[PDB]
Design an enzyme around this catalytic site. Structure first.
Site, PDB file in Angstrom:
ATOM      1  CG  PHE A 233      -1.978  -1.029   1.156  1.00  0.00           C
ATOM      2  CD1 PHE A 233      -3.211  -0.778   0.592  1.00  0.00           C
ATOM      3  CD2 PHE A 233      -1.723  -2.287   1.675  1.00  0.00           C
ATOM      4  CE1 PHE A 233      -4.181  -1.763   0.548  1.00  0.00           C
ATOM      5  CE2 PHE A 233      -2.697  -3.284   1.640  1.00  0.00           C
ATOM      6  CZ  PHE A 233      -3.923  -3.019   1.074  1.00  0.00           C
TER       7      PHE A 233
ATOM      8  CB  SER B  72      -6.579   1.109   0.466  1.00  0.00           C
ATOM      9  OG  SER B  72      -6.812   0.711   1.803  1.00  0.00           O
ATOM     10  CB  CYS B  73      -7.691  -2.560  -4.043  1.00  0.00           C
ATOM     11  SG  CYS B  73      -9.342  -3.360  -4.121  1.00  0.00           S
ATOM     12  CB  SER B  74      -3.614  -5.485  -1.738  1.00  0.00           C
ATOM     13  OG  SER B  74      -2.290  -5.896  -1.966  1.00  0.00           O
TER      14      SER B  74
ATOM     15  NE  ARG C  86      -3.357  -1.088  -8.305  1.00  0.00           N
ATOM     16  CZ  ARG C  86      -4.123  -0.736  -7.276  1.00  0.00           C
ATOM     17  NH1 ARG C  86      -4.456  -1.620  -6.344  1.00  0.00           N
ATOM     18  NH2 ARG C  86      -4.560   0.514  -7.186  1.00  0.00           N
TER      19      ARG C  86
END
Ligand SMILES: [Cs+]
Ligand SMILES: [Cs+]
Ligand SMILES: [Cs+]
Ligand SMILES: [Cs+]
Ligand SMILES: [Cs+]
Ligand SMILES: [Cs+]
Lengths: 249, 221, 245, 235, 241, 247
Positions: free
Chosen positions: C55, C162-164, C168
């Site tokens: 993050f 918040s996505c980790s 991606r």
């Protein structure tokens, strides 16, 4: 299947006909037919006819008339009152048949009087056939590609790159065509063309105008939104819209 | 604030016409805080002319403030002025709306039905303010139909589904005007450029809902 | 029944006496940290915020301040998520191996200060770690979370979750310090151009940018600048996904 | 530390006892005005709003209503910036003579009410280490909701250094920006280049501007400009 | 100096007596084939057109048709480029080893038909570029082409499909079909200059940057079509073509 | 009639025997140079294309190749238009002094070629006639359609369909032309042309560049905003702008 023997087919057929009347539209196919006719038979044995009608634009008529002169043909306009046949005036689905009938009936009258052996049109091998006429490109298996090639070989350069088509298509089936609404539609399409859109339709839905453009040009149209809206409102429409599925046919 | 709070104490028991807006939330919370949960009845109107999101959000929104909420359904389409979409429709609708709230108030026992300056309102809002608002105002679906047009269950559903779709693409301010076989889409002109990637999908989507041609008005609003 | 649920939550807190809260900055953990502070006092609550390579630093600083503003004594902790191969090799089970490492650290922290349990904000819509979800044990339903917050004055939490950054990367692709820095830098750039909702999906020499479809038209003016920037950040090719988000 | 800085502001205010606040309507001026009110009381704080030939009449009124709604006794004042030749002739330090004239008037008013503050980040906020991110936090923490999300700079920024400002060009410029604002562009500048209008927009908004091209061209042309252009580097 | 250029070409042709031409369909190959026909006659000229997996069937047919129109004895042959390992695994040397397979087959044709040389159209395999030896410039080719009546050549250039794949990625019949089907689709939407770059599960489209503005209306339609053709992700390269 | 218009023209060409042609690349000069080639032969026709600081190198090279492809011996010549004070001072007279200087050179070339006249491509509707040069199409009553008529008959199919004015139109009448600003304006338009915008004007307003594009093309310009801004700024302009009222 060679372009050369295609041409040879076309030449021998014309030499056999000796004297022709040409249905001259101003497009590439009509230009190739009129040009080849003059090149084989000479100006005195070829008559170019251009139809003046309420269903096609005056500009199409005027440039076609001059285009025939540039090709070296004695050209003759003739006026056709398509709205005089009730199937067309009332825009039934059979309208096309009565239009072509009225059109080919007129051309055969002309040819019968100037002594010609045939009416000639620019049908090419591409559901359309018309017995009282000779489609010499279709008869010699001219494809769209063969027309452009033979046209460049001869030097023909100046035809009308857009077809535009009969205005009856801008009205729904069952709707009556009048001088006012036809003029209303023609004024609208002439405007949109002057902004830079040669392929355009203004479909008539009474108080709603629905504009068809090629989808690839819709982005570029945005800068004209307000001007088209206000102008087409001056012509009688209350709402001016853009069909999201763009130009279909 | 002094006058409004005193007015509430005088009425003692109230029923609130709850919209979810700045006014409706502030009055309902102050009514609940001044008159208590036992003395306040919140009603939110369900009708065929407004979307379920306005309704379902309002019922859950008021419960979060701590008031007892009561839904009521109104068949606006039973009034011929509304069904036939005359220009006077608004007047008969509001008349039908408050007669329903007065019937409700009479039976629950309320002293009044409450509705929703703005610069003075924005200040009192700051004392608490809360969240889970309803920051967007609604409009009746009657505006999507011309005056001569008769409203049916199907075309209202048809138009509402179309707007619900267009809203989900990211265009919260939209109208799909109904003209039989033609849909006429109103978007804010500043958004028409952003709409272009959705052209073909909106066309096929609104077409499956019943429209034959799907169009975009060159004049936006 | 809202009061009935809050009383249950209070009875759980008073009974536990000392707690450590996994504070995310979101509405739920904020509500838990507020109630924990209100029931046991500043001295008996320790709020923990996790710093990790998965993050952004901005996200960590934001949570740390949100805990500070509520009046909680807050402690950061750093986690080496990349030491576990299940994260490092980004298998589909990575989500749990990360959360297991997280709650184990919370138990180490909790064990040394004296807390009776670790607190998180799970909601009625971890077990292997003795973590308790008091909001979910008392049937808080997200509508109750918004409700108790208004009752308490809670107004300022972390509105967007918040996505980790592992999202991606495709499964099986190995994460390095540089890949993560590459991706986060790319999204930091693209957010700064005015696109708060964005992803830079990592495909080795390809960057695949996901945007909300309605924003692609506005994006065109930045193509060459974005192309050259993400190219200077390590990508060789910079592309934009035709299917948006 | 976000509370340690709040304590600095509160400690400084009690020390000042009585305050005069330069209230702009923005986030920073709003935070100071609220804190002065709550630490010093409504009776010991006076909010002053500057009106001049260089800012919008709308900008003034939005500031006046917010200050009253925050509960402050607010006082308007007009400044004739165009009376100083450095401002009228827009030399490069024109900012300095305008700011000097502004604080000289604000110092005048304050002495007569009796106060012993502005929103820079004397600026009691820039003393307690506020870095814009700290200001929004105290604004959210305090319940402040309503200020000016768009920053209003003086219109003298629309003219090149050396151009003398008249009422006509100023009005022309303000009319143009007011027009462009009504179309949906809250952040905009119309730079004055005699017969050329050079329009600055945020680059993220240039795409959406296209549908309005011909309308602004004819509109800004009607206001006195001959050529109406869009700066490719935007705002 | 142009009339001496033609003369060099005529003498070089007359000296060879019998020729086979690598015919691409372009202006240069059209000029070479036409002059060889004009100097040596149909019976002493063999036009060769290659069908292969790295170029389109449409392009193959158009070269065949252009050669027939000039009146040449035309001979098609197929080349299995993927049987050479340099091509199948697309190392950076692919272009050169591909050309070797091409010139070996034509020289095989030439040896059996009776020709003195394999001729190609260019302004170590015995191939001969007669327009080069005689020093034709693009300007000189267009000049002699009109002097002869040639109007119909292949105005569109043609790159090998190996350019759509990165070095190291191995080319198969299936992915090649995928790439070509995709580009033909994009062409049918109206984008004549396009590449669909292959990155296994990712499609990467290169377009002329001036047409990227116009492309947006097809975004979702291109996505689903190329996804249906085998790609998982459909992307657009920001630095254009 | 057209058969006998070609006839007047072919008769006129035979009388002069050797000619020099002012070749612009347009249909009209293309018709004349082609007829001179067809009637007098390659050895007796010399095509001249002028290079100057007021026109693009692209236009120059395109005209030179069109003459080469048509089969004419083509010869370039350069004119220093900025040496005449009337041209440098961008009065409404500048066009005439340019055409005077241009025909004056064609006459020297002609005197060395051995040609009997200088031919230009002017048709029926002072510099041209002061210099004594001759418009053979005017002399057989060729009207625009007769030019197009004969172009097809000869096979002429490839001319330069786009006209091009002198660079002075990018400057107001009061502004005096310099080498540096001319370079500034021309580099910019060549830049914009390369982006895919063949129709472009870069109007010079000292520190301001004001770009004219067709409105239908303004939408397409967006991906080039920042590159055009920085490129024209590197050329000497301070501000790079786009006129909302297009071309
Ligand atoms: Cs027929
Ligand atoms: Cs409903
Ligand atoms: Cs970090
Ligand atoms: Cs003012
Ligand atoms: Cs093939
Ligand atoms: Cs030049």
């Amino acid at each position: 299947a060679t372009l050369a023997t295609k041409k040879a087919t076309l030449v021998a057929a014309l030499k056999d006909l000796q004297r022709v009347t040409v249905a001259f539209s101003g497009g590439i196919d009509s230009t190739l037919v009129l040009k080849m006719a003059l090149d084989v038979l000479g100006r005195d044995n070829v008559t170019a006819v251009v139809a003046n009608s309420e269903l096609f634009t005056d500009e199409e008529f005027d440039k076609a008339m001059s285009l025939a002169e540039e090709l070296g043909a004695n050209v003759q306009g003739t006026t056709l009152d398509y709205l005089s046949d009730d199937h067309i005036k009332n825009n039934t689905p059979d309208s096309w048949y009565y239009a072509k009938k009225m059109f080919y009936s007129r051309l055969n009258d002309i040819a019968a009087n100037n002594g010609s052996a045939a009416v000639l049109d620019g049908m090419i091998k591409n559901a359309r056939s018309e017995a009282g006429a000779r489609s010499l490109l279709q008869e010699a298996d001219f494809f769209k590609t063969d027309v452009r090639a033979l046209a460049q070989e001869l030097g023909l350069t100046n035809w009308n790159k857009v077809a535009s088509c009969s205005v009856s298509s801008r009205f729904p089936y069952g709707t009556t065509l009048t001088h006012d609404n036809i003029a209303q539609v023609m004024a609208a399409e002439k405007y949109l063309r002057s902004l830079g859109f040669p392929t355009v339709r203004v479909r008539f839905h009474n108080d709603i105008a629905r504009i068809e453009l090629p989808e690839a040009r819709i982005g570029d149209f945005l800068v004209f939104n307000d001007r088209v809206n206000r102008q087409l409102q001056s012509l009688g429409f209350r709402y001016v819209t853009l069909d999201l599925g763009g130009f279909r046919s």
